Point group: D2
Amino acid sequence: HLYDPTTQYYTGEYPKQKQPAPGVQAKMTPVPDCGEKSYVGSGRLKDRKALVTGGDSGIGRAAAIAYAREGADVAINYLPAEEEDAQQVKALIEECGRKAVLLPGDLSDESFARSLVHKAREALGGLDILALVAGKQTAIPEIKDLTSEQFQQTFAVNVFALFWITQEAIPLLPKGASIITTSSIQAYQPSPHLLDYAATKAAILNYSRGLAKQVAEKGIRVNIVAPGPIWTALQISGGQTQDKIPQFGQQTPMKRAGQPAELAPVYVYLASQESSYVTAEVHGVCGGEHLG
Amino acid sequence: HLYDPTTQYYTGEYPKQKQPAPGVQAKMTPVPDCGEKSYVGSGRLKDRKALVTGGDSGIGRAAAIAYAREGADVAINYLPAEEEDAQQVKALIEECGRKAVLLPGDLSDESFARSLVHKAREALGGLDILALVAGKQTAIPEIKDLTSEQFQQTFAVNVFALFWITQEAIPLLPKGASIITTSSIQAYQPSPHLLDYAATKAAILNYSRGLAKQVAEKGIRVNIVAPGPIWTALQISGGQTQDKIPQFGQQTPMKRAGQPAELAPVYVYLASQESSYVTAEVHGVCGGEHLG
Amino acid sequence: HLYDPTTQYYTGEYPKQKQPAPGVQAKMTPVPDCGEKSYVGSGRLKDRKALVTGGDSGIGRAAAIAYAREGADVAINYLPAEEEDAQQVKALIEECGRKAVLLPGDLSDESFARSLVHKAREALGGLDILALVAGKQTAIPEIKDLTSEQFQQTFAVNVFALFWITQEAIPLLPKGASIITTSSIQAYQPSPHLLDYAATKAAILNYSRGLAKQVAEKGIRVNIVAPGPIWTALQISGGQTQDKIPQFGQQTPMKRAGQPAELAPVYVYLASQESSYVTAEVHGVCGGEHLG
Amino acid sequence: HLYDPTTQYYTGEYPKQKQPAPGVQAKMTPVPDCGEKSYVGSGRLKDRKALVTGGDSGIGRAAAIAYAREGADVAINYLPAEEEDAQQVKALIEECGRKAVLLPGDLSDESFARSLVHKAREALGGLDILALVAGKQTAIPEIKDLTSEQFQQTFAVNVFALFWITQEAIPLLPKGASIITTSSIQAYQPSPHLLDYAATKAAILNYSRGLAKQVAEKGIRVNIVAPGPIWTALQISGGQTQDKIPQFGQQTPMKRAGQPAELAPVYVYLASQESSYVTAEVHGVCGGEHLG
Ligand SMILES: NC(=O)c1ccc[n+]([C@@H]2O[C@H](COP(=O)([O-])OP(=O)(O)OC[C@H]3O[C@@H](n4cnc5c(N)ncnc54)[C@H](O)[C@@H]3O)[C@@H](O)[C@H]2O)c1
Ligand SMILES: NC(=O)c1ccc[n+]([C@@H]2O[C@H](COP(=O)([O-])OP(=O)(O)OC[C@H]3O[C@@H](n4cnc5c(N)ncnc54)[C@H](O)[C@@H]3O)[C@@H](O)[C@H]2O)c1
Ligand SMILES: NC(=O)c1ccc[n+]([C@@H]2O[C@H](COP(=O)([O-])OP(=O)(O)OC[C@H]3O[C@@H](n4cnc5c(N)ncnc54)[C@H](O)[C@@H]3O)[C@@H](O)[C@H]2O)c1
Ligand SMILES: NC(=O)c1ccc[n+]([C@@H]2O[C@H](COP(=O)([O-])OP(=O)(O)OC[C@H]3O[C@@H](n4cnc5c(N)ncnc54)[C@H](O)[C@@H]3O)[C@@H](O)[C@H]2O)c1
Ligand SMILES: [Mg+2]
Ligand SMILES: [Mg+2]
Ligand SMILES: [Mg+2]
Ligand SMILES: [Mg+2]
């Protein structure tokens, strides 16, 4: 029973729609499909313990759902404004028979970002998967309109918090632990309206590779997922200009945007012990708008 | 039950050993682990129909085994000299309860290479996975010793046969079909003893991306796997100079070579319908000697 | 005296035109600008001795002209059907005060490709720059229409001849010699209508890097130039489909195609002893349609 | 005469030595060669007006010297603790018959970084080349020892100051202006002792490409230079561990480090109007330790 991947998910134009960042995905048209009805596990992460940032919505939610479906207990971080989305994820994790831990807070607060790993490990009784998916993205077509405050904040959420969290995690992660970070096609093909954001995506990719090299001897793997155009709240809450929303994703070879569901399998592959010889590698999921 | 990936597979030095190309893996010390005793499926390729070139040994064998474990019927191609290795794979596929088809023949013979798709499709009653893993690799440290015959033959097996097979397959492949080709870290970091070989690995990566773009509209995906140093018969039958064998793999961040078993999960991910938004992408499995 | 690079060269649309390959650039509308009236040398290649393949027209011609302007004697190879264009380059070289040598012949003939190096060295009294610019490019939008004959011929001209020439040259090249090969943006972003061609451009880039590593100890440097869309005979003699000619180049950030003249400065930089710490590197000239 | 580039500059081991950052290159053993006696101009930048950050020492010094030798007036920025180096550069610029402007100040201060562009333009009577070479680099082999203060300072100097300067410059730069930023091999091959630094080098590369796309229509070009191992004060004032100093550079295919002199030619190529079809491109100068 083979499906055509070009028509498997929504292929129509997206309604124009806007929300204040970071957005509530439950309010979108359509709501992003994060695999709630479709993802089926096979115990590839049995009794693993995961922290997922951005686990309330979008790609991080797809990873959180799949991780629970594969047998892991899951802590999610997200912003308080996203509590309604986070509560849906709590229910999805618990329905898998797993433990859900909800740890809201702002990753641009260094002390919060540092405390998070320890709170999650205590609540879960361990920690051996980190999926760092949270991100800020604000489209600004002309550099004269790009403020210092925005530029620095994008780096704080996307790069500095990645350092703060991983620095706290390394000493406590067991041999076999897996860290998955989140870059973008933008790391390779930066758009002129995402000067700060695309540069953070490049920094994430590079930092992840350097960290991988440094911690390989501790038995810890660090890998990167770089999605292409995925239908998510990040894109309707300022990540794209409003005029780009209707045809979002249609320029890819597959002629549609991805849904977050389609990211879960690679997050599972990388978390799983099956990817034992994989570290420092980036994985594209871009509808043919390929990395390189 | 978490394992340290750095110590999970062989970490000793490799004895010096040499066989005539293409080599018989059963004569190696150690014999490459292709997942015979470890790979467990979950129905991710149920009733799929795969052709795997190089399916007798090494990475292609690991893919063939995993595909059968995941529920697929499998045809393998290999050279007659490798019949003993291919017979072991026949048994492994049949022990999964699936159909095995052995189609020996030389891929540098265009008429044979083109016929292979038709033979596999007839035997299997269809065809919807192609894993193109066969390759020639001959180390020559100084260009004065690199013959035109060798250079051309490396391109025939690694590039021309990829074109011949894929051209024959495209008109027959159903929507949802998945093609997986095999590049190398050498495509990004070519070594001076592999002038022809590394250039073919770069050509494979590029051709696969172009093909992906061309066939996306037909619902066919084309992706690339690029391994790092993996212990296989290719490496002991002329792919490496003899002096490079004992320490093979030890320069990677993980400080060991990979085993073919470790490549099967990505070949399954890419064959599976789960990778619906993945086309034209390369996937590294290199022990931290990363692509880019 | 600063000019706007966006408007420095023609920014408008091109008329459809087709010539049989390889094309006569003197018959194009408009004729490509190869720097005939603009390039000014300063002795950076004084008394050097260059062989330039494809030196009759296009990018190779721009390199040949600039090399003579910088003080080098220059031998050009080209196909005999291109004699009109070659005779123009002969005059241009002589008008720089240097010696021109015209060595027509088909690089897909291995005997001729190998002899070329020796004929050029004998005629020039030495040889210490090789600019390998000749290429075949044939657009075929659907793989069903891509013949084995075309695929192999593309590899013969673009890859095998590069190997034949460089193998023949290495034993005779002095310390300080510089080899410059020619890839493309297509090596990174292959178009579905150029499956064979783009794969050769990737192979050239890779082979050049491996060769650079092998011959560094001999004091020889090997570097690569990867142009973007440049207005040339290759593009109107089958390299592009006719429908792609009118707006050729207009998709780049600079909104125009390049002219061959604009490639000369990087060919000079790489030939010159000034690039002493540069080997195995690729240099993009793409109007902002950047390489990786 | 033709020179062997592998032995053109020193090939042996370097004494261990340390200075407080940012170092004084005049006190190094040996002092880096920045082209003081070797670089000869030909008017390629006649009457151009350049600002060079890090213009006191190392690669920025080599660019500043070459720019003046090619006919440009040159303003240099540097930290005021570097006056011993900066004063030498003033003399070198003036000895070419050009105007020198010394504008010291710490680029991590946003107000200073923004003011710098205006002060330089006022002092020079215009501004049409920006070579942004300043950088902080601090080796820390283990993440436990990498402080937030260091991480953020490395991003302030290397990334935020690049944004501050370029944002301030764009509105005032004429058509034809050229911006050259400075990345590294580390952007592609990050080392585990340089987690923050290498990530900044990837961010610089990416931001530069995005900026180039945004400002192409304004007739401004933006390109990147990515050196390999170059003997400079950055390396002996904390950028490398002491144990990495003795064999610095010997791992490249050329088997030596570069000297800053060897970077000048690409900075001139990119500043010059000759590179009219070059924007968003990165240029490696790495002794064969090539970029992607
Ligand atoms: N959607 C795409 O097209 C796309 C493409 C490439 C990469 N990405 C990456 O995917 C990741 C997830 O985003 P998404 O697209 O799934 O959208 P999303 O909006 O569903 O997820 C982003 C999440 O970031 C978190 N976040 C933002 N700022 C935060 C802060 N200050 N503190 C704590 N959490 C914060 C929020 O919890 C939010 O749910 C991001 O890193 C993004 O860069 C997305
Ligand atoms: N082992 C490594 O370190 C490594 C690294 C990167 C990529 N690879 C790639 O992995 C692929 C598989 O090789 P492997 O390392 O598993 O070793 P292997 O020797 O087990 O597999 C190579 C197979 O190629 C097939 N082959 C060779 N010439 C053929 C011909 N003329 N006709 C038909 N079949 C032919 C043989 O059947 C052989 O089993 C190759 O494409 C190789 O480039 C290997
Ligand atoms: N024009 C572009 O948009 C573009 C873009 C990227 C790369 N390139 C590369 O530029 C190089 C030069 O081509 P160009 O665009 O300047 O066009 P061109 O037509 O002016 O040059 C190509 C030359 O190739 C030579 N050639 C072809 N087949 C040959 C054979 N069998 N034997 C001997 N010589 C042969 C011909 O002499 C011809 O002049 C090619 O390698 C091409 O791949 C061009
Ligand atoms: N030397 C190498 O191996 C190497 C390799 C790749 C890239 N680079 C890059 O080359 C560039 C120049 O460094 P270099 O190696 O020539 O050494 P260098 O020490 O001679 O130059 C670095 C300069 O940075 C400037 N700088 C540092 N912090 C500053 C601040 N807070 N405010 C103002 N100026 C500041 C100083 O003026 C200093 O001279 C850097 O951007 C570095 O990342 C160097
Ligand atoms: Mg959210
Ligand atoms: Mg075999
Ligand atoms: Mg011609
Ligand atoms: Mg200094």
